[PDB]
Amino acid sequence: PMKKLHVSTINLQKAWGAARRVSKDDWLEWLRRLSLELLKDSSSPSLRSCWALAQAYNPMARDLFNAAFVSCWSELNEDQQDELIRSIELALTSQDIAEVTQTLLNLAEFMEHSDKGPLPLRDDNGIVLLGERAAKCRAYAKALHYKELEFQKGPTPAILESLISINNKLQQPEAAAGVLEYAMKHFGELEIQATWYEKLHEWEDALVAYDKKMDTNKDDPELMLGRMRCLEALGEWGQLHQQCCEKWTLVNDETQAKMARMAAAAAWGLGQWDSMEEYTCMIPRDTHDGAFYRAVLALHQDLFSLAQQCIDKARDLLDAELTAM
Amino acid sequence: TGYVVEPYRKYPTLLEVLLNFLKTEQNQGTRREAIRVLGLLGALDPYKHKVNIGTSEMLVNMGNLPLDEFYPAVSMVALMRIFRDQSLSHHHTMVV
Amino acid sequence: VGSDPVILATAGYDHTVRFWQAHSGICTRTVQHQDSQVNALEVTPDRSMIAAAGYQHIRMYDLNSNNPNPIISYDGVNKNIASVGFHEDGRWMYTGGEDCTARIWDLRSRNLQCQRIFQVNAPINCVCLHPNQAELIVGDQSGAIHIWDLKTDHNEQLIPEPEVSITSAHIDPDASYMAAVNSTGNCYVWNLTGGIGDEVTQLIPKTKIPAHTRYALQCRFSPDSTLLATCSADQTCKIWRTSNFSLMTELSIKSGNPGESSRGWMWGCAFSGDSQYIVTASSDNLARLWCVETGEIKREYGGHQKAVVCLAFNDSV
Amino acid sequence: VTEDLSKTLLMYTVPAVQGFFRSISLSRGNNLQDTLRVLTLWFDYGHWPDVNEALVEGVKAIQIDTWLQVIPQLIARIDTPRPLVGRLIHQLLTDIGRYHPQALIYPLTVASKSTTTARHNAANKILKNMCEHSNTLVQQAMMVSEELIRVAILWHEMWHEGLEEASRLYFGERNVKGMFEVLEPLHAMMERGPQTLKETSFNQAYGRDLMEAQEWCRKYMKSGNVKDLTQAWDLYYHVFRRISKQLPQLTSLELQYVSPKLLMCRDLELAVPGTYDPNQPIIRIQSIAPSLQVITSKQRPRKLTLMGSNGHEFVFLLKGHEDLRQDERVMQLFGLVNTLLANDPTSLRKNLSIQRYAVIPLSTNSGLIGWVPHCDTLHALIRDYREKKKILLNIEHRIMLRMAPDYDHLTLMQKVEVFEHAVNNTAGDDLAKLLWLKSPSSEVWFDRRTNYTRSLAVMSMVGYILGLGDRHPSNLMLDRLSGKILHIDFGDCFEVAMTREKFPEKIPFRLTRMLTNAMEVTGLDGNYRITCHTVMEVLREHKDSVMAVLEAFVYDPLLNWPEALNKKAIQIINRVRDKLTGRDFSHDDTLDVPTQVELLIKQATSHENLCQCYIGWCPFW
């Protein structure tokens, strides 16, 4: 029947040339034009037929992004293949907008199944890069998959750390505990960092380790932040608010705001509304947690209009959050 | 009225459809109202949501199908997915 | 076969036995042992016959005559047999298999039926002889060493480690100490009361020896009782001093490269007439004669197509 | 003494019965455990007049629907010699027939065909008791029973097996009475006459030679000379060769020639087997697909299809020579475990539900099985993946033979060595990559793997408690859509496979290298071990109900298929109690959940135990 249409590699590389896409609108537009150009330049006649409806209907374009790319990629020369590989590397690295990065990750995952084999990215078939980007875009299942591929290629304590982080973000505490058990079995010489117990949610052990590290070394921003996170999780409002008071008196403004994010919860716990106001003021205005903290403040001063405004802003931010997850 | 949480139990799709709005339409006022509704109805336990509620085939076959036979399959699958939706007649023309 | 004072025997899964000269490492002749692989190879004190243990049967060949057929064949046992022993005069034979029964046999008669049977709870494995030749020390899969008196049936048993299969048995020529190993790789030793005709053969425990981690499956004492060599499934063997039981010796065939590792278990050992030289099996289709003091390669007996299992090695002037 | 103890038991039991009845009425649905409690008290101490009176009051008060959950136990005691207990069971079954006869007809239909005279009479009595309101249902159910017996095993397979076994009895056992007794009913199979086109075809094809051989058999009876029997067996061997050649050709069965009645059936009021629930509309049978696929297995199980009146289609497997009553009982036990895991919140979160399929035994040796869709047996999965990768299917076993061509004769440690080499030289990563490829995307794949690991843990550990055996890759299935593991054979139970002379297994369950690799990268210690901890916690917390179910198992002669049998049942129940309590390994000691789970995982993963198993068991896989 019909033959395979000849791919114009020039337009393929031109479409992938996202050198001057910056904003979210720019990247979404680039994705749209990319998918449409892929359908137009695809060798399979059926895809190029679908192109018109894709142009009239963007979800149509999205649905066949993978198949169109597969056709084009199978139609390319090895050198042109490598050039396209570099271009997609740049596209992944350029910006972590959710939609474009998710589409590219889906492309890579799709081509993993294909008999041709995954995309030969720079060194590791994209495992490192794809895992990093998937973690950035909260597509945590892909992150876990690629991190496990890293593990198969060889386990390291950093790999275990990231594996625990992903599993925790993937709401799998038992798998995380399994990773800890494996680390102890095979890496017992390595003292388990407090961050690991922090992610595993054995807050008691994390707090004990942080107390030890404090005895070794004080005034370390990471160590203090982790210890007070453990305190918040354990609900130790007293000790949390104390340490918050001293460090707030003594800590730099950026770390001060990061700490205040939950020193506000400490103030709730003890009801010290003045410290609550101080910490909330430290927290940025355009922040979901900060917005809610300012709302509860305003309602403690009975400023109902300000509380409603804070609720609206926090609900906008939470709308973004839901659209993400 | 206080008709909280029970809407999920009686009407499972009620939950999912709400989330669909956060994906479907773009008006900030409507989305904010959707968030307030979701809050008022309560953060339902995910297991309770699953109890209330109770491409893939394309990829599975792709694992077996050759590329030449693969492309028309996805083409027609997506075309017909668009086609069945009766709200897309002006698209149905290009679909046919 | 007995032309050379020193005679070496070897066997594997290829259903072919082979013979060798120790010092020169020169093959003397091959022998056919089909219908089963070779578990235990032993030479009678007279060195006129060799016994090879297989499945359901034990087959004997002659040394004085070259290219004979199986001179004797014992059958009847319903399971695999890996244990061999003879009385110093070459009259009695002692065997034991996975069928949980150890059997006595008459070599200088047509008593094709077992003289006696001794049953134990679990499958039986390699057995060894108290130098007084009136007591057998038996290892089984339950982990229970069984001391059975041939004459008065005075029977005792001891489990040193909870429910772990033990595969080894040997007692020093002086009868002063006994030793064994198990799957865990630990090595266990005991002291023997100086009673020849006392018939009680009381034992005394001795400290555990974690010789290896992998499966430790062999145990032999030197003719002079100076040394105790144990093979182990980490493709290694370790020799300990009888006087102190402190380890200064190692016999490893590890390739060094991690990918090539797991090459083949160290499957047997046999001391020279002075403890100087050790001839040991290896499931890399090989057997090797090394010097104990140096623990270095001196000879290898190649020729096998399939992995080696056991060896028989005797020294005489 | 004995009478005083009996009085003590009665005065502690009557309150027990009354309290259980009130609790059952209060629970309204999550009362399977209590239902078994009251059944235990009934079948043990029911005969005492006061206990029976309390039982009658409870039966009057209790809602009838509950009893559905335990119809299999009730009919298992249908022929109880104790007259009072039997009378009360008869009244209860009559009421159940009056209200929900669909839930009751099928096991009762079996009981009618029971060779036991007491069971036969009781079943017929109860059947005529429901007939007054369900004549059409009873007639249709009995006709289905007879016709599905006809379809399940055809005269071809009946005669193949009869001649094979009889020849074994002669040339192997020489027990004249053996073969002649075996063949006599098979001769009655034609002397009753054919009733279908396939039966008539078999008659015209072979029944002439069969009749001649039976004449020779009668000649041997009257005379006893070896000549007549020799001619009889020459004819038998001839027809045996012919039918054996035919059998591979019968790759399917058309209903029109096999059982016209089933094809004629339509718009029946009979519920689809094993799909009736009083809280749902009855799914009535209006179809029997004319085609039936026969699987090439030695038992030659048929694949049947029905159409539900609701507008949904159902598939079934139909097996003969298997006492699927044990399978039904095991499936009820798994249902009990599903209720247990749904009740405990910790397990409730993680979806530890055991996958189960409806089992409808419709004879003492033949029955039905719910066909679970989208399930690929593990052996098929591995074979398909290796064929796609062009890896030789038995590559591991081939390597094992390559070092040790006489593996089966090796001692234990030699076997361990060769097996360890075979494992090491082979990647053994087939199942993980397979679950990866079958899945559409990592998001779906992760849910599949989580469900797979948790289901494998749950069912493995429950199988250890049950003593399930021969867990070879043909008896494990993966659900493509969900990934849950599914076990599809329970012929061996209670460590029976661990005692047989032919390759006695020595592993409590299947946890081979490939399944572990299919888990997360840190396989055993993560999802699987924690899930096993939770499952043993649940099952030891409520060990009494499981013990009662397994008592219902053992005290019938099924597993042994009288004092010796009672001793064996007592020992099996004692072992199960040890498993539930922790005294399995060190009887003197009691092992906590983590300790026992770790010991089990060590035993099931240890190469020493794995190597001992049948090569066809695929321990290396």
Ligand SMILES: Nc1ncnc2c1ncn2[C@@H]1O[C@H](COP(=O)(O)OP(=O)(O)NP(=O)(O)O)[C@@H](O)[C@H]1O
């Ligand atoms: N309950 C079930 N659900 C779905 N498929 C099933 C079920 N039972 C059996 N099958 C399928 O049908 C096949 C029948 O083989 P099997 O279950 O082994 O039958 P058998 O009569 O026990 N034969 P064998 O065990 O090989 O002697 C299985 O391998 C599955 O493919």
